[PDB]
Write a protein that binds this ligand. Sequence first.
Ligand SMILES: [K+]
Ligand code: NA
Length: 306
Amino acid sequence: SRPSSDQTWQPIDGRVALIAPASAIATDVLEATLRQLEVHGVDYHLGRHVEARYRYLAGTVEQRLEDLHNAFDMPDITAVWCLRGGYGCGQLLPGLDWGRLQAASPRPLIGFSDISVLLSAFHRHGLPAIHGPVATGLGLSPLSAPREQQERLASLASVSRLLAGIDHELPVQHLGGHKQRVEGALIGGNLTALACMAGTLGGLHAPAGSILVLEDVGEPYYRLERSLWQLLESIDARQLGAICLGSFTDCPRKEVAHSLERIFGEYAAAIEVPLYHHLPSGHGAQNRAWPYGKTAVLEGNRLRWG
Ligand SMILES: [K+]
Ligand code: NA
């Protein structure tokens, strides 16, 4: 839409498994998160190791795998909502039992940031997923600007709304390349996270025709370029349908002579892949959920899925 300001949650049937596959979580934020799930009538299961700490990680690989596997063992679970991104979920890939995950009834995996790595791996294995807010967004101290807090809340609500199938599109703007309709699977997420898996068993799943969404946070422009060069070189980039930029938050220009649009535009043109931007997805208050690995269409000023 604009995106829409609407922030009423839809009911979530069943039970949401909460896991922490990446960075460690604060107890106060966790408790506030759980209280908000109860406010919304959302039944949950809290992973046994979500309060573990191992340097900045939410416990060891083994602890995190125990919780991730358990989320697929339990019969009543209808979604797996990651509590926090940051760093570390790619570490789980060597030990992940894909057969155990595939045997379970459908339960979309939800998150963004570092979680983009698991979203991609899930897509590779035909498992449903959502790129959207992490669950601890519910427990954060409110943003000081009321309008930004409202946008955080609309972004959090978009998870249940997408699970329910009631939201179907997000706004975009064409930036470069051809203007024809593009239809393909939605992939991507955090540029840094995905570049940091290239050359590994967790490299981005990028089938032909896909719409590659990219967002990032906290990066100088040269580092964004370095990540983009790596990621595009590492996949069959010329076979992509489109690149669609979300937000680039806390990435100040610092006197770099070329804009971010110029840099991304140059890379997209060199592979003859059209470029879109202004998708309301990323690390700002605007972080609307989108269905990961699902077919969508870029046409005029919208990204629309069925
Ligand atoms: K980053
Ligand atoms: Na390549």
